[PDB]
Design an enzyme around this catalytic site. Structure first.
Site, PDB file in Angstrom:
ATOM      1  N   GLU A   1      45.262  31.124  27.916  1.00  0.00           N
ATOM      2  CA  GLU A   1      44.022  30.781  27.217  1.00  0.00           C
ATOM      3  C   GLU A   1      44.208  29.855  26.015  1.00  0.00           C
ATOM      4  O   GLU A   1      43.268  29.151  25.623  1.00  0.00           O
ATOM      5  CB  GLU A   1      43.271  32.044  26.779  1.00  0.00           C
ATOM      6  CG  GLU A   1      42.729  32.887  27.926  1.00  0.00           C
ATOM      7  CD  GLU A   1      41.648  32.203  28.787  1.00  0.00           C
ATOM      8  OE1 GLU A   1      41.155  31.073  28.481  1.00  0.00           O
ATOM      9  OE2 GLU A   1      41.285  32.819  29.806  1.00  0.00           O
TER      10      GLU A   1
ATOM     11  N   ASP B   1      35.525  25.176  27.168  1.00  0.00           N
ATOM     12  CA  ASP B   1      36.523  25.684  28.116  1.00  0.00           C
ATOM     13  C   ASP B   1      36.586  24.787  29.373  1.00  0.00           C
ATOM     14  O   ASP B   1      35.929  23.736  29.427  1.00  0.00           O
ATOM     15  CB  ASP B   1      36.259  27.161  28.475  1.00  0.00           C
ATOM     16  CG  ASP B   1      35.015  27.375  29.374  1.00  0.00           C
ATOM     17  OD1 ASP B   1      34.379  26.409  29.862  1.00  0.00           O
ATOM     18  OD2 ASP B   1      34.635  28.557  29.561  1.00  0.00           O
TER      19      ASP B   1
ATOM     20  N   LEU C   1      34.561  33.271  25.077  1.00  0.00           N
ATOM     21  CA  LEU C   1      33.372  32.517  25.512  1.00  0.00           C
ATOM     22  C   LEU C   1      32.211  32.840  24.559  1.00  0.00           C
ATOM     23  O   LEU C   1      31.887  34.010  24.340  1.00  0.00           O
ATOM     24  CB  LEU C   1      33.027  32.878  26.964  1.00  0.00           C
ATOM     25  CG  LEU C   1      31.753  32.316  27.583  1.00  0.00           C
ATOM     26  CD1 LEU C   1      31.848  30.783  27.695  1.00  0.00           C
ATOM     27  CD2 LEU C   1      31.450  32.959  28.956  1.00  0.00           C
TER      28      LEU C   1
ATOM     29  N   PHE D   1      39.050  38.761  32.926  1.00  0.00           N
ATOM     30  CA  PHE D   1      38.884  38.040  31.657  1.00  0.00           C
ATOM     31  C   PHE D   1      38.395  36.595  31.903  1.00  0.00           C
ATOM     32  O   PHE D   1      37.423  36.128  31.272  1.00  0.00           O
ATOM     33  CB  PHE D   1      40.214  38.046  30.893  1.00  0.00           C
ATOM     34  CG  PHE D   1      40.136  37.526  29.457  1.00  0.00           C
ATOM     35  CD1 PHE D   1      40.109  38.418  28.369  1.00  0.00           C
ATOM     36  CD2 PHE D   1      40.180  36.159  29.184  1.00  0.00           C
ATOM     37  CE1 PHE D   1      40.102  37.939  27.026  1.00  0.00           C
ATOM     38  CE2 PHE D   1      40.137  35.673  27.863  1.00  0.00           C
ATOM     39  CZ  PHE D   1      40.086  36.558  26.776  1.00  0.00           C
TER      40      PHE D   1
ATOM     41  N   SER E   1      40.443  40.116  49.283  1.00  0.00           N
ATOM     42  CA  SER E   1      41.677  40.156  48.475  1.00  0.00           C
ATOM     43  C   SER E   1      41.868  41.567  47.925  1.00  0.00           C
ATOM     44  O   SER E   1      42.980  42.114  47.949  1.00  0.00           O
ATOM     45  CB  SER E   1      41.632  39.194  47.274  1.00  0.00           C
ATOM     46  OG  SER E   1      41.320  37.858  47.608  1.00  0.00           O
TER      47      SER E   1
ATOM     48  N   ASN F   1      45.225  35.104  50.507  1.00  0.00           N
ATOM     49  CA  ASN F   1      43.773  35.224  50.454  1.00  0.00           C
ATOM     50  C   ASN F   1      43.209  34.833  49.066  1.00  0.00           C
ATOM     51  O   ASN F   1      42.175  34.152  48.962  1.00  0.00           O
ATOM     52  CB  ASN F   1      43.357  36.627  50.857  1.00  0.00           C
ATOM     53  CG  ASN F   1      41.864  36.743  51.045  1.00  0.00           C
ATOM     54  OD1 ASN F   1      41.153  37.158  50.132  1.00  0.00           O
ATOM     55  ND2 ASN F   1      41.370  36.324  52.215  1.00  0.00           N
TER      56      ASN F   1
HETATM   57  C1  263 Z   1      39.923  45.268  38.931  1.00  0.00           C
HETATM   58  C2  263 Z   1      40.684  44.272  39.787  1.00  0.00           C
HETATM   59  C3  263 Z   1      41.675  44.733  40.661  1.00  0.00           C
HETATM   60  C4  263 Z   1      42.387  43.829  41.451  1.00  0.00           C
HETATM   61  C5  263 Z   1      42.086  42.470  41.352  1.00  0.00           C
HETATM   62  C6  263 Z   1      41.087  42.026  40.477  1.00  0.00           C
HETATM   63  C7  263 Z   1      40.748  40.556  40.359  1.00  0.00           C
HETATM   64  N1  263 Z   1      39.906  40.152  41.499  1.00  0.00           N
HETATM   65  N2  263 Z   1      40.376  40.249  42.720  1.00  0.00           N
HETATM   66  N3  263 Z   1      40.852  40.350  43.905  1.00  0.00           N
HETATM   67  C8  263 Z   1      40.378  42.925  39.685  1.00  0.00           C
END
Ligand code: 263
Length: 162
Positions: A11, A20, A32, A104, A117, A132
């Site tokens: 950051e 940003d 932000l 964040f 993911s 992914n």
């Molecule tokens: C709380 C959390 C757990 C695992 C990954 C992420 C970020 N987003 N994705 N995939 C957020």
């Protein structure tokens, strides 16, 4: 390395209002202020956040104070989110830092499209998760940072941050 050192790398630190990567008024360590294009609206948010009339400038201590608040609220947010909490709690401490970093940067609404993911991460299918994760606006717009965060998710080590 820890979440503070990690986000500080990603950051930066700027004591005057700047835009940003998305063109939004920001200050400190990725605090932000607003998505409004009005610099005056941004200055109001700044003054509100700090508790004095700052005229677009803060101190290092003030930047670090906002940073502590912002990291804390990101974590607490994850914990309050029924979709995110179980995945977060399944992770080791290093991969948890990757999760905090991504939230964040993007926000919770930001990660709504990451359902696939999230599932791979819960399954601990680390290479598949990493593939992914990169199929995203996130990765394409901020590839250098996304590469570091993804490497952290993939390995559970701090290799990308040294
Ligand atoms: C709380 C959390 C757990 C695992 C990954 C992420 C970020 N987003 N994705 N995939 C957020």
């Amino acid at each position: 390395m820890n979440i503070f050192e990690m986000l500080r790398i990603d950051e930066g630190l700027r004591l005057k209002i700047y835009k940003d990567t998305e063109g939004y008024y920001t200050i400190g360590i990725g605090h932000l202020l607003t998505k409004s294009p009005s610099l005056n609206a941004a200055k109001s948010e700044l003054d509100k956040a700090i508790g004095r009339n700052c005229n677009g400038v803060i101190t290092k201590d003030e930047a670090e104070k906002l940073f502590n608040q912002d990291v804390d609220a990101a974590v607490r947010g994850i914990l309050r989110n029924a979709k995110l909490k179980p995945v977060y709690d399944s992770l080791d401490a290093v991969r948890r830092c990757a999760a905090i970093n991504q939230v964040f940067q993007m926000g919770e609404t930001g990660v709504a499209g990451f359902t696939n993911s999230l599932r791979m991460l819960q399954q601990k299918r680390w290479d598949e998760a990493a593939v992914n994760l990169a199929k995203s606006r996130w990765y394409n717009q901020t590839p250098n940072r996304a590469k570091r965060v993804i490497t952290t998710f993939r390995t559970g080590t701090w290799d990308a941050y040294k």
